[PDB]
Amino acid sequence: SHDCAKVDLENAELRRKLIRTKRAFEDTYEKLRMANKAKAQVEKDIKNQILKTHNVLRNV
Amino acid sequence: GGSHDCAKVDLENAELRRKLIRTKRAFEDTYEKLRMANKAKAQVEKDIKNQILKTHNVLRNV
Amino acid sequence: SAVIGQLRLELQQARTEVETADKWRLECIDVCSVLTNRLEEEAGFLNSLLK
Amino acid sequence: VIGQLRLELQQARTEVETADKWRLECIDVCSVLTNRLEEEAGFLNSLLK
Ligand SMILES: [Zn+2]
């Protein structure tokens, strides 16, 4: 047997905590995905810049 | 028994605890990855600043 | 007497020396222009990374 | 009896001196700019990790 009121209260509290943690994880995961995307773009543009400079130094 | 299905709420509490441990761990791991990413990016931006200053110093002295 | 002859030769060598010095000087200026423009572009890019 | 040609021939030699002087300064400039571009490209490459 259990405490019926106690397991109802714990059910509700767990659902609340789970939703809050889900929202926190979804927000953090989206921030990290956007960060990874931005970093990937940066690395592509950096590659192009390195290529421009090595072309310049080569033509010298 | 009383106003709920006792077995059902026992199972649902146990599953909610499992899901909460998993989701907590996912959030902590992702947050740590984000914290590391932000720190590395901050360091990169400091170094970028110093590089810009070095280049403008050269160009000015030219 | 005949001093005009050799002096013309020395002046023509000097002309070739101005041609060489000015030629390599302009080539160096073109190089410096390309390198400066590239440094300005790259500094602008690095600045763009801070936004 | 002319004499004056010494200045004109020396002015031409002074012009070689000026051109060579600015050229050597330009070579120093190009060396500094080249070194800075090499350093900067190395830095940008270092960001790729
Ligand atoms: Zn019950």
Expressed as residue numbers, the domain containing B14 is: 4-62
Measured on CA atoms in the order C1, C2, C4, C6, is the torsion positive or negative? Answer: negative
How many residue pairs from chains A and D have C-beta atoms closer than 8 A?
A: 24
Contact D36 B51 (CB under 8 A): no
- Cα–Cα distance, B13 to B7 (Å, whole number): 10
Cβ-defined contact of D41 to A54 (cutoff 8 Å): yes
Name residues whose C-beta falls within 8 Å of residue B33's C-beta, 6 or more positions apart in sequence.
Answer: A32
Between the alpha carbon of residue D7 and those of residues D2, D11, D13, D21, the distances in Å are 11, 6, 9, 20
For residue A4, what are the contacts with CB-CB under 8 A and spacing of at least 6? B1, B2, B3, B4, B6
Cβ neighbours of residue A31 closer than 8 Å, sequence gap 6 or more: B34
Q: How much distance in Å is there from the Cα of A8 to the middle of ligand 1?
A: 8
The total number of structural domains in chain D stands at 1
* Angstrom distances, CA of residue A13 to CA of A5, A21, B9, B26, D6: 12, 12, 13, 20, 104
The number of folded domains in chain B is: 1
> CB of A35 within 8 Å of any CB in chain C?
no
Subunits that touch chain B (at least 3 Cβ pairs < 8 angstroms)?
A, C, D
Chain D contact for B23 (CB, 8 A cutoff): no
Domain that holds residue D18: 1-49
The gap between the terminal CA atoms of chain C, to the nearest Å, is: 78
- Name the residue among B9, B27, B38 with its Cβ closest to that of A24: B27
- Residue D23: CB atoms within 10 Å: 19
Q: Name C40's Cβ contacts closer than 8 Å, sequence gap at least 6.
A: B59
The DSSP result for C1-41, as a single string, is: ---HHHHHHHHHHHHHHHHHHHHHHHHHHHHHHHHHHHHHH
The number of helices, as runs of H, and strands, as runs of E, in chain B is 1, 0
Q: Are A28 and B27 in contact (CB under 8 A)?
A: yes
Contact (CB<8Å) B16/A21: no
